[PDB]
Amino acid sequence: SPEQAMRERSELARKGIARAKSVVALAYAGGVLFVAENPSRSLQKISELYDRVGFAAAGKFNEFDNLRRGGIQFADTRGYAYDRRDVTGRQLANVYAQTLGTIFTEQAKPYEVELCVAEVAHYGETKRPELYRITYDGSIADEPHFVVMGGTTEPIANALKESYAENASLTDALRIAVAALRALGVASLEVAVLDANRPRRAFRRITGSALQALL
């Protein structure tokens, strides 16, 4: 009975992802901001895929680490085959969707992960940043404002929906991010941004005394 097996796999994945912490990603005037609850300095949940593409995930570390490595390897080959400016986040999202669907269909145990892909405009141009969400079974959706994955999303989703404001600054949006996640100091917090004013590479981490000053 394929229906029963699909049901069991779906409940297994949902129960697996329900355990992990929460990570949010929202768009502000300068780009995209990632905020996550991470007690560890060594193991990281937010990373960089390419010049203008960011990565974020929740769940089991050894799974989305492999997914991130595969995405990086896919991204690097394409920019050598054609060009650096021919790489977009939609292709990476599609690749992730296909991989997750195949894993869910064929593997013995499904991956208990939830991914998100963010992109920003090139230097000197204007464009609305794009956010994608990929679900453990291969489902892909596009979000205009924010993505929340991990733990109990609904209260955080309501808080973010109520208190969201477009074209905000870094301190402002960071404060709603922290407040919504609270509904947390320098430690047990991971913060990264996709800066659209940089010439080539848009990814940088905010840690140390700068995070204390900003928050």
């Binding site: 085959a81 060009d83 400016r85 021919d86 292709q91």
Partner: protein, 222 residues
């Protein structure tokens, strides 16, 4: 064979001859050597006649395939990279007697200044490419004479008519100095073929204009 290309304010033009030769015997009289690859690029290949037709068709198929697959056309650098890879992959065949020397001309719609959006790219045997900055380039067995003619005649180019006239004159000189290149045929009525690329796209030049220019040049040289 000889193919020339030059830049004028607001576009770029390409032209080529029509003669095919097997040693010292003429076997072709109306061969076409310039192709429209996509809406904003044109390609001209010199060397073995059989390889060029295959080369252009493969290149066009590749570009259209990428366009259909990804939903967005490639950038100019991507097209140059694909052409360079295609040229590099034919070294053994060139060694065994199948050589192709391509020339690329195009119009970049994603540039800043629209009056200098034309590009000319030349390729070497190994597979290296270079973007011309002098404004003209030529390939084939009579390219030296055409380049030397353009070096002296380039000062008169201001628009799409002057560039076409200069290209026809360069082809005439190349045919004058080389026997493998065919000149205008007045008895039969065969003239070179040209392509003009501008902000609107790549279009073919009607034969009447080329015939008029060739007649003017011939009467001038008499």
């Amino acid at each position: 064979t000889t193919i020339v290309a030059l830049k004028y304010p607001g576009g770029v033009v390409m032209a080529g001859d029509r003669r095919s030769t097997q040693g010292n015997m003429i076997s072709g009289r109306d061969v076409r050597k310039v192709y429209i690859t996509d809406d904003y690029t044109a390609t001209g290949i010199a060397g073995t006649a059989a390889v060029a037709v295959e080369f252009a068709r493969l290149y066009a198929v590749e570009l259209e395939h990428y366009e259909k697959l990804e939903g967005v056309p490639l950038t100019f650098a991507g097209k140059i990279n694909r052409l360079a890879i295609m040229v590099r992959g034919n070294l053994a065949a060139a060694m065994q007697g199948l050589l192709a020397l391509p020339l690329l001309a195009g119009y970049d719609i994603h540039a800043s200044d629209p009056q200098s959006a034309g590009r000319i790219v030349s390729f070497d045997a190994a597979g290296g490419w270079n973007i011309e900055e002098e404004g003209y380039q030529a390939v084939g067995s009579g390219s030296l004479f055409a380049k030397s003619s353009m070096k002296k005649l380039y000062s008169q180019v201001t628009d799409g008519d002057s560039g076409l006239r200069v290209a026809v004159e360069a082809l005439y000189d190349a045919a004058d100095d080389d026997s493998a290149t065919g000149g205008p045929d007045l008895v039969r009525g065969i003239f070179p073929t040209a392509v003009i690329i501008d902000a609107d796209g790549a279009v073919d030049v009607p034969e009447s204009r080329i015939a008029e220019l060739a007649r003017a040049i011939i009467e001038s040289r008499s």
